Subunit: 133 residues, 2 copies
């Protein structure tokens, strides 16, 4: 990087002015959202779940995450459909709006703010203060 | 009581030879069964209940037991119907057989053996050993 009049070494992170900033930011945003939903669903107690289909989902999700080794298209499909029904999203580059079920969220079947805070902490190295959400 | 050749004083309990033994025993049996069901339903945590109608039942049961003061025919009716659907009984004098839901029992919405043991302990002054149930 030619800051000032000398060359330094950029450690990491994006350089906002390249050929594809807004789109890669959108991709990264969706990634964090999905990661938070996954952590939310996996970090909840199973016995407290009422619906049989939802346990089935959580059980087989743990399967497809750690036990399995390669892709399983049908699981991905039905989970993506589940997310599209309980967590609709609107994404412009790093700027999101979420319309989500409220009782599911209360029970812990989708992600609320706290999950985003935890995810950002251990995967982004920042602390998202709750005065901005 | 003219045992031996002298008169003593009977402290309590039935004299199994009067004019109406088997029927009064049947009544007392049904009483203990209903008491056990009531203790079972009231001694269970509310938040763990899944169905809304059942939390309504438990809530209003506590109402009609302690908060209220006189009878409420509709509550009695619908609770009696509830029992007739998830507890079905066959009573000869002090000798019963029960055909009951199993998953409700597991969750704690009807009475299992343990509730009978507790009820007999504090309301009959005996310890019902589980080798006879």
């Amino acid at each position: 990087v030619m800051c000032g009049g000398s060359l330094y070494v950029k450690p990491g992170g994006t350089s906002s002015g390249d050929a594809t900033t807004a789109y890669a930011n959108s991709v990264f945003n969706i990634c964090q959202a999905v990661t938070a939903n996954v952590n939310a669903l996996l970090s909840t107690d199973g016995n407290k779940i009422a619906d049989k289909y939802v346990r089935n989902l959580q059980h087989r999700l743990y399967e497809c995450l750690y036990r399995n080794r390669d892709v399983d298209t049908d699981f991905v499909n039905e989970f993506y459909a589940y997310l599209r029904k309980h967590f609709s999203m609107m994404i412009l580059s790093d700027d999101a709006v979420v319309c989500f079920n409220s009782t599911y969220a209360s029970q812990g079947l989708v992600a609320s703010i706290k999950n985003f805070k935890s995810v950002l902490y251990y995967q982004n190295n920042v602390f998202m203060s709750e005065a901005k959400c």
